[PDB]
Ligand binder design. Structure first.
Ligand SMILES: Nc1ncnc2c1ncn2[C@@H]1O[C@H](COP(=O)(O)OP(=O)(O)OP(=O)(O)O)[C@@H](O)[C@H]1O
Ligand SMILES: Nc1ncnc2c1ncn2[C@@H]1O[C@H](COP(=O)(O)OP(=O)(O)OP(=O)(O)O)[C@@H](O)[C@H]1O
Ligand SMILES: Nc1ncnc2c1ncn2[C@@H]1O[C@H](COP(=O)(O)OP(=O)(O)OP(=O)(O)O)[C@@H](O)[C@H]1O
Ligand SMILES: Nc1ncnc2c1ncn2[C@@H]1O[C@H](COP(=O)(O)OP(=O)(O)OP(=O)(O)O)[C@@H](O)[C@H]1O
Ligand SMILES: Nc1ncnc2c1ncn2[C@@H]1O[C@H](COP(=O)(O)OP(=O)(O)OP(=O)(O)O)[C@@H](O)[C@H]1O
Ligand SMILES: Nc1ncnc2c1ncn2[C@@H]1O[C@H](COP(=O)(O)OP(=O)(O)OP(=O)(O)O)[C@@H](O)[C@H]1O
Ligand SMILES: [Mg+2]
Ligand SMILES: [Mg+2]
Ligand SMILES: [Mg+2]
Ligand SMILES: [Mg+2]
Ligand SMILES: [Mg+2]
Ligand SMILES: [Mg+2]
Lengths: 472, 469, 468
């Protein structure tokens, strides 16, 4: 048969490893200091005991068992209880403030034999080490030893560089069958943790780097390229909160769709968003406004001057206003918050104000990856998503988005300024709709105390899209 | 000329100009997980199963049991061939609880099995550069006298560092293959190179490959001979008016490009293109990289076409995938793979601009030439869509500059007429045919696209903001 | 400082005569560079071209194999050994060492009356300060013996130290470096004379190709070679285009057909190539975007029978992806094919295709080379160049190679009355008058037809003109 694997039950990993770690073989987990090796090792054992009734041995080489049990209480895992229930054996191989190899393989086997233990975690084998071929042969002996037992091993290894050699010595890499590289890449002044499976001998795996976050629920990996173009798509309509906009969308937005609001600063994106949120609470549905530009304080003042009261919506428990600076974390961290926050609130409508805030400084690819995730998560979860985008230029803009994410959205609302008679008008347009007919008219519109009023088209003008048209 | 032995690895025999030179050792160096072992296993396996050429595998770390088990993954029974006496896994790995000695064992094994092939994996784990060359030289030199073609595995620490670990292994061997696993920004890319073959020609540079269920599959971008068939056979676009604008419809043996701003009607044309195939009981595949099976099924139904029906009839397969789910190399395989099972008459990729996201224009072009080329030589009508970055005033058909690779170009654009977003369609070019040269207005309905009349009384129609005459 | 001719294509140019006589020349380089091929070709040429006997010292490769490897290039070293013009000296170990070697070299030189010596590789012998003296000794002895030697050395890094130990350079009188540099995924073979003590040579690196004929270097600087130029005319194949140029294209000239995709560059090529064969003259067609079947089909739709012209051995079609080879290799394929057919006209369709993925310096070098070869061999070259922009193009070429062409035929779309019409312009003609009018031209089953100019329009060059 094909190489049998053993599920780790670490969010994402088992999809990246196409099942889990090859059973009976050792797997190297190497990374710089604070990459998540120990955690990868604990979480690996814990889940086997709790879920599969597979006992585990943790082989510490410096961390006192008090501290291992103590660090586990942070993630809400109680190791002490599994010790006292004879399921998890912590095997202190740290020296009190040669016997190595043969002596230790006996000790770890006396424990492997004693607990019927199907899983082992050695952390960190590096600290035992010796020149170049010394680490290779002493290591190899240990791997080949455990393979004879028929036990499945996680081998924490250290690193000095972030994209340097795999291990410390340039040997371990090859001794082991399965190699996992953790990274904590400094991208500007922020840190992006990624896990890569370099090889699993005798089996396929997902290639490349995958981002993850160490939350209070452990390692959470988002398989960026393991989401499936496999979501539901109804014809159920919903209201935008603007009646003339619903008319122009051929009877309102689709429930299962991503809507994009594109225009210069001060064109009315946050007004359409505010409105899009107030419609959900008006029909007794929960909504989340993900603000990254304005504070709750300012989002209420401005909403109340447009006629709508966020307070009664919040108190009724139908509207959550979140608010975060994009620079406060990295994209994976934000994507984590958003997914986390949608689960505990279970809304029918998400709104992010704005994507253009989150694209700042971050690379185009890194940004798009975030957008394929948030767009993709909403789509498969049957949640309507309105995403605001502020164009870098206020006039003469030729591209909808500067990040080029138009092919990812289903519906594009387009706000733009228009200069007539030495004044600055606005002009909404339903630029596209996937499914609906939609109005093809660039209707002028005004904002008041009442909200948005969508009047008539500029029938007697040429080059409306320019920003300074000419009366025909 | 030097005599070569066919390896039966997809792409290698063409890259090596006939296989590995016979009676010489070939060095295959790479970083961890590069496909070194796989290359050597295959070398032997494909040798045994095809030409009844027996082979020997020397292993210094991996147990023989494991070389047999790992091989089962690719659906090959190495165990059956050990019994049959065609293979022999000479276990040279250390015991948990020699230079000339091994050579004698390897020599003995060769005659003891009439073996024409060898694979020593890896001759580094056995190990001072002064010393490593002398013994490595002895081994490779010995094997030349035995008269046995050899694949010798060696390890590396850096993708563009020294070819092998000790800056010696290279110069000893007659033949050097580098397997690479380059990090293309969070996505990996597997390339095979032949750095030197003493006494013969080969192909130069990096050639990308994939490790799959069927082993190593290399796509030689530079040997796919631009020597492909052609006809004047016409196939319908799925729109009678567009067919007329092309001068009888599309050519069968042609790459078509549908270009335009976001939501101009590309994915609609892709739909009508695919349906028309199912109408004439001909198979087609729809490669969707932006929508989803449901949203495609839906959006099409609101255009009066049942994809649900076509799939049930097995005349339409829909392969949905995110562009960033894998690197280009993998995609090209999936695309080429899905075309070999289903054996279609027409292919559709929606869209190319989606795949060019976050990738060097080179990797893209090579990929595009790849798919273009394959469909062309396989006599398959290819409709590819491209979203222009600029919705109005676009000065270039594509930002990837792949217009020259296409044969036919359907250009869709927005036209601002009396405060409205009207659309237009013009057959920009058509190699072989006449085609209409008119920027004719069209509307989309429940029925689909209706191609009306040109903007006769307008100036600067392309700019997207025209002017009344 | 007297020099020995290598007869290695173009090396004698770079070296200003060849290798300094009675001195060793280091030829360092990474694996697969062509050091062993260089040193073999240095002796072989020495024998066949001057009857200068050579001695080849091998420290790894068995004499048996060195012969087998050479049979590749069509050279028979076995015959040259039996005849005693070449002596392969085996100094490999079994499967007082430097001095023992000198003696055996000095033995063969005196025994075989040998002018040339090749030692590959001196490095492999050794196993830093110590390497210097042993090498110095080896060279100093060979200068006493009075032998011009080639000495191969190996390198780890492609732009790192000129030799393994960072010494071999300083001890040698002459230094040559072979490089096999990686341009993305394609390889580029470059040769560089780093120094020749006592003499002049061409500085910097020069590309080369290892072919069935050995090391073929292109000294991309020492070209010009005078080239001849006449006022002889040649029909373009389009009657009006012939007039608009002032009697046709000059015989010894570079024609450029720039324009947006689908404007008709390939049609202008097709007729240009036909016109040669209508006057029983050979022409090669170098295609980089269209297969011979498609070129055959589309031509047949414009009237011309490509198949008929191919049978009479007048018209030759090439066809090759740019991504298949590098630029140096493409230059060779063309330089080769011209020699094997000796055509009156080459047609490259397109230069724009071959510029893909390459640096403009690397590309522009390629163009200089193709131009200068066609110009000096008096082959009239038409070249096509599809522009990046189909309307609003402000530059004739995006490669900036307009100064390298003598004549430019500029096609462009013109937006008239809601339709896409094309226009032909003779943009320049060094030597002739040429028409200065932007003319409209249709393409029918019969080929092109150039009608009347757009005199009643403004802003034609933009592609969106205004009626006035
Ligand atoms: N409850 C928690 N909430 C959030 N982050 C946490 C929590 N507990 C631990 N972390 C973080 O997760 C990281 C996990 O690193 P881990 O303890 O696995 O070290 P390691 O990767 O083995 O490296 P080292 O060799 O330095 O021990 C810690 O550095 C810590 O910053
Ligand atoms: N009470 C009001 N009466 C009338 N118009 C108002 C009122 N309050 C705000 N506006 C209008 O609404 C605009 C506010 O911009 P809005 O938040 O709607 O859009 P936005 O594009 O998201 O803004 P930004 O790009 O600055 O984040 C102001 O420029 C103003 O013209
Ligand atoms: N059945 C399979 N399907 C897909 N990929 C596979 C399969 N089996 C193995 N692989 C891939 O092959 C790689 C391992 O190949 P191989 O063992 O030849 O590597 P290697 O370069 O010899 O490594 P090392 O020398 O460090 O052992 C892994 O990265 C894995 O993803
Ligand atoms: N039922 C319908 N009735 C009328 N018009 C429709 C209908 N369905 C779609 N349309 C129009 O046609 C467009 C369809 O375009 P299509 O789905 O081909 O997108 P596209 O041009 O591929 O662009 P993108 O890649 O950005 O989605 C819609 O945006 C809308 O303007
Ligand atoms: N007939 C041929 N046609 C084309 N290329 C050839 C031919 N014969 C050999 N080559 C190429 O030319 C090179 C000749 O190798 P050569 O032994 O000269 O290199 P080298 O740098 O001395 O190698 P090393 O130092 O590793 O021994 C090889 O890369 C080979 O691929
Ligand atoms: N039989 C025909 N009748 C009329 N026009 C034709 C015919 N065949 C081709 N054409 C026209 O010729 C054009 C193609 O010209 P050609 O192939 O020379 O283009 P090009 O300038 O080389 O551009 P590219 O190489 O980018 O395709 C088509 O756009 C088409 O309008
Ligand atoms: Mg730790
Ligand atoms: Mg705002
Ligand atoms: Mg291996
Ligand atoms: Mg689409
Ligand atoms: Mg050599
Ligand atoms: Mg062309």
């Amino acid at each position: 048969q094909a190489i049998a694997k053993m599920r780790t039950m670490i969010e994402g990993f088992d999809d990246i490893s196409h099942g889990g770690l090859p059973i009976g073989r050792s797997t190297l987990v190497s990374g710089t200091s604070g990459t998540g090796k120990t955690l990868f090792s604990i979480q690996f054992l814990y889940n086997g005991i709790i879920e599969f009734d597979e006992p585990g041995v943790f082989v510490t080489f410096e961390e006192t068992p008090q501290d291992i049990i103590k660090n586990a209480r942070s993630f809400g895992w109680d190791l002490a209880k599994l010790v006292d229930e004879g399921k998890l054996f912590i095997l202190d191989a740290s020296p009190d403030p040669g016997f190595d190899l043969s002596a230790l393989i006996e000790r770890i086997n006396y424990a492997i034999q004693k607990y019927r233990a199907r899983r082992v975690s050695i952390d960190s084998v590096t600290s035992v080490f010796d020149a170049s071929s010394v680490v290779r042969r002493e290591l190899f002996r240990l791997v080949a030893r455990l393979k004879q037992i028929g036990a499945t091993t996680v081998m924490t290894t250290e690193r000095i560089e972030e994209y340097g050699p795999i291990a410390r010595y340039g040997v371990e890499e090859f001794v082991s069958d399965n190699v996992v590289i953790l990274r904590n890449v400094l991208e500007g002044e922020r840190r992006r943790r990624t896990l890569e499976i370099l090889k699993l001998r005798g089996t396929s795996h997902m290639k490349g780097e995958y981002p993850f976050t160490i939350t209070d629920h452990g390692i959470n990996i988002f398989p960026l390229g393991a989401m499936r173009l496999t979501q539901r798509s109804s014809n159920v309509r919903v209201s935008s909160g603007v009646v003339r906009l619903d008319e122009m969308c051929g009877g309102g937005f689709f429930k299962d769709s991503i809507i994009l609001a594109t225009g210069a600063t001060g064109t009315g994106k946050t007004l359409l968003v505010s409105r899009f949120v107030e419609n959900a609470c008006a029909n007794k549905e929960r909504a989340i406004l993900f603000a990254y530009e304005e504070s709750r304080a300012q989002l209420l003042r401005n909403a109340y001057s447009w006629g709508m009261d966020f307070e009664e919506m919040e108190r009724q428990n139908l509207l959550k206003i979140v608010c975060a600076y994009p620079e406060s974390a990295g994209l994976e961290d934000h994507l984590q918050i958003i997914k986390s926050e949608i689960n505990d609130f279970k809304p029918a409508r998400i709104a992010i104000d704005s994507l253009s805030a989150l694209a700042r400084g971050v690379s185009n690819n890194a940004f798009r990856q975030f957008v394929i995730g948030v767009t993709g998560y909403a789509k498969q979860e049957e949640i309507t998503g309105l995403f605001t985008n502020t164009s870098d230029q206020f006039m003469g803009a030729h591209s909808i988005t500067d990040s080029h994410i138009s092919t990812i959205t289903d519906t594009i609302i387009l706000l733009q300024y228009v200069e007539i008679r030495g004044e600055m008008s606005r002009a909404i347009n339903v630029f596209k709709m996937r499914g609906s007919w939609h109005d093809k008219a660039i209707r002028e519109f005004m904002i008041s105390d009442k909200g948005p009023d969508i009047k008539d088209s500029f029938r007697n003008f040429e080059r409306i899209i320019s920003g300074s048209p000419t009366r025909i």
